[PDB]
Each structure stands twice: as C-alpha cells, then as structure tokens.
Amino acid sequence: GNRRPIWIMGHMVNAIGQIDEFVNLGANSIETDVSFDDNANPEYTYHGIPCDCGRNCKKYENFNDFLKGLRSATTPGNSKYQEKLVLVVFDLKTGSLYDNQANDAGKKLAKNLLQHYWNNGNNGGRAYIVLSIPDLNHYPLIKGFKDQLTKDGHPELMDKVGHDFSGNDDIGDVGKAYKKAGITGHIWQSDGITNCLPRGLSRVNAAVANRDSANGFINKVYYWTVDKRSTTRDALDAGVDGIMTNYPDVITDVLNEAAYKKKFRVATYDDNPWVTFK
Ligand SMILES: NC1(CO)COP(=O)(O)OC1
Ligand SMILES: [Mg+2]
Numbered sequence: 001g002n003r004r005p006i007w008i009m010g011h012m013v014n015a016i017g018q019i020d021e022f023v024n025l026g027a028n029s030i031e032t033d034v035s036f037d038d039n040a041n042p043e044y045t046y047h048g049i050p051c052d053c054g055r056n057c058k059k060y061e062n063f064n065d066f067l068k069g070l071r072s073a074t075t076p077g078n079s080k081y082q083e084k085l086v087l088v089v090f091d092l093k094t095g096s097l098y099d100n101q102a103n104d105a106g107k108k109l110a111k112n113l114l115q116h117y118w119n120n121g122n123n124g125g126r127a128y129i130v131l132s133i134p135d136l137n138h139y140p141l142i143k144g145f146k147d148q149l150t151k152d153g154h155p156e157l158m159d160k161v162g163h164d165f166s167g168n169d170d171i172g173d174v175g176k177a178y179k180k181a182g183i184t185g186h187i188w189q190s191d192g193i194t195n196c197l198p199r200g201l202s203r204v205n206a207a208v209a210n211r212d213s214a215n216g217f218i219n220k221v222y223y224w225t226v227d228k229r230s231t232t233r234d235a236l237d238a239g240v241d242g243i244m245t246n247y248p249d250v251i252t253d254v255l256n257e258a259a260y261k262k263k264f265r266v267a268t269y270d271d272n273p274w275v276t277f278k
Contacts, residue, residue, distance in 0.1 A: 004277050005267035007087055007242035008251045011225050012052065014045040015059040016069035020082070023073070026252035028266055029087035031132075031224075031244055032070075034063060040097055040105040042112055047093075052225055052246055053196040067116035074125035086269045089130040089164065089188075089244075094138050102137075106144025114152055121154055128273045130188050132164035136177040139165075143181065162186035162219075162274055168193075171206050175217045186274040187217055188242070192224035195246060201238050208239045211276060219276045229254050236260060241277065 010022030013030035022030055037043040042063040051057035061069070070088060072080045090109075097105055109131070118124035133141055142163060149157050163183055165174050168191060178187065189211070191204040204223050210216035222242025223235040232254040235243055245251050255264050267273070 003263055003265040004239075004241065005271040006236075006240075006255060006264045007220075007222065007267050007273070008248050008255075009087070009089060009222060009224070009242050009244040010248055011244050011246050012047055012055060012057075014047060014061065014066070016061055016066060018059065019069060019073045019085070020080070022248055023082045023085050025248040026266075027245075027248040028084045028268070029089065029127075029242070030085065031089040031091055032066065033091045033093055034109070035093050036097055036101075036105055036108075039108075040101040041108045042105075052194055054227075055246060064112055064116045067112060070127070071117050071119060071125040074127040075123060076126065077123075083269070084266075085127055086267065086271075087128045087130065087273050089132050091132050091166065092134070092138075092141065094133065094135060094141065097138075099135075099137055103140040103144035105138075106131075106141035106146075107148035109141075110145040110148035111152070114149060114154060114157070118154070118157055121157075126269065128160050128162065130162045130164050130273075132166045132188075132190065134166045136165055136167065136169055136173060139177050139181040142183060162188055164188045164190050166190045168203065171203070171210055171218075175210075178217060184217075185219060188220045188222060188273070189218040190222055190224060190244075192222075192226075192244065195225040195227045201234065204235070204240060205238055212239070219274055226251070233260075236264060 007029045010027035010030040033047040035044045035046045044060045045066045046060035049057045072078045189207040193199040207221045211218040220241040223240045224244030
C-alpha cells in the first residue's frame with residue numbers, strides 16, 4: 001500500500017536559532033515548550049531543569065519573539081522559509097497555573113498566536129499547530145483558545161489547530177476528556193518518556209489500536225523521545241505517525257533504510273495532520 005507519512009518532531013526547540021538547526025537535520029516538525037506567567041499569559045519558550053539527557057535545558061525566548069521567528073520559518077517568500085517545516089507542537093507547561101486559569105491561558109495563547117504567528121491573517125505562518133496539554137483537567141484551555149480566535153474574527157484558523165494530551169493518561173480517560181471538551185477530530189496521541197529512562201510499547205500499541213479501530217478517537221500517534229535507531233524501528237514497526245527526537249538525523253537515517261523507504265515517507269504540507277492514515 002501507500003507509504004505512511006511520518007512527522008519527525010524535533011524535541012525542545014525553544015530558541016529561534018534551533019528551528020533551522022533541527023529542520024536542517026531532517027525534522028519536518030518541532031516541539032516547543034511554553035511557560036506561563038502568573039496571569040496565564042505565555043511568557044517564555046523555556047523548559048528548564050530537569051530535561052532530556054544530553055540537552056541544554058535553558059535556551060529560551062520571549063514567547064512572542066519565538067512566534068515571530070517561527071512565522072519567518074513558515075511563511076513562503078521569507079528569507080528563512082523552511083518549506084519542510086509543517087507542524088509545531090506547543091508543549092503548554094500549565095503546571096504553574098491554577099486549574100481555573102486553563103481557559104484564560106487558552107485565550108491569551110490565541111491572542112499571541114494570532115498577533116505574532118498568524119499575523120492577524122496577513123501572510124502568516126502556514127504550519128499546522130498542536131496544542132499539547134499535560135493535564136486532562138486543563139481541557140477548558142481549548143474552548144478558551146477557540147473562543148478568543150472567534151472573538152477576534154478568525155475562527156477559520158482553528159482549521160490549522162489540533163490537540164494532544166501528553167500526560168500518559170489511560171486512553172479511555174483521554175477520550176472522556178475530549179468528550180467533555182466537545183472535541184471530535186484533529187487529535188494526536190502522545191505516548192512516551194524522557195530519553196533518560198526505558199519504556200515499553202504497551203500504551204503506544206493501545207493508542208494505535210484505538211486510532212485504527214472503526215470508532216476510535218485518535219487520528220495520529222507519536223512516540224517520544226526517541227534517540228536510537230533500534231527504538232525508531234520499533235516505533236515504526238508499531239505503526240506510529242510521529243517520532244519526537246533530539247536527533248532528527250537518526251530518525252531520517254532509519255527512514256532511508258531500504259525496507260523502511262517502502263512503508264514510510266516524510267510528511268509534507270499536503271499531508272493533512274488531522275486525517276487518520278489508511
Ligand atoms: N511534552 C512532552 C511530550 O510531548 C514531554 O515533556 P517535554 O518537555 O520533554 O516535551 C515533550
Ligand atoms: Mg516539551
């Protein structure tokens with residue numbers, strides 16, 4: 001059959017200069033951490049210690065500066081345009097917020113993305129965006145984000161927006177969270193653990209099983225963080241759609257192996273990230 005399109009997701013891409021670094025190593029997507037201030041406004045692209053093994057944890061930007069850089073990287077005609085960069089996952093570090101600030105945080109995020117990434121609809125960045133939320137109880141962030149885009153007069157940008165709950169919750173609990181949020185597509189399911197620790201495939205297999213069932217709710221599955229060729233082959237063998245990595249070149253090398261070239265290909269802008277692969 002057709003090759004499954006694969007997102008090679010650069011991990012912890014939090015300084016503007018790292019966007020090119022990861023894309024030039026083969027990533028067609030990046031993951032960026034978003035810290036929030038005491039008012040639920042996005043503040044920095046900052047992960048902080050502890051972080052993945054082998055990585056500097058403290059590179060960061062003002063969030064809106066990063067967005068402007070991401071916009072340059074994803075706007076056709078810009079001198080820094082990277083046609084290959086087609087998906088950005090924002091790892092929303094909402095751990096610092098009270099639960100009743102989740103909706104507010106979504107609204108503030110939408111205002112920043114609209115102003116600095118989508119440029120108020122004037123020739124903005126073209127990448128698809130995943131809002132990745134680590135706590136199922138923060139699902140009201142999604143409605144806040146959508147209602148703010150709608151108030152500002154750009155509800156159509158939701159077409160470029162998808163969803164992830166990154167806490168490794170039980171898959172049934174995840175689906176109930178989406179049901180409470182009223183979400184019925186554009187769903188990515190993360191599964192994983194820091195590259196510092198070992199992990200098995202039980203939950204990622206269960207996520208794949210949900211995605212490929214007739215009435216599942218997951219559209220795409222990605223495994224993180226994968227820095228080794230053998231783990232990459234395992235995750236591809238299990239049928240994932242995305243691999244998050246500190247080393248995009250390692251993933252690329254496996255995908256260029258002859259047996260994997262026949263079954264996978266690097267996703268491009270015309271691969272809709274919200275559509276389950278068949
Ligand atoms: N959110 C994850 C999973 O997508 C895990 O934490 P992280 O900061 O390593 O980024 C990726
Ligand atoms: Mg992260």
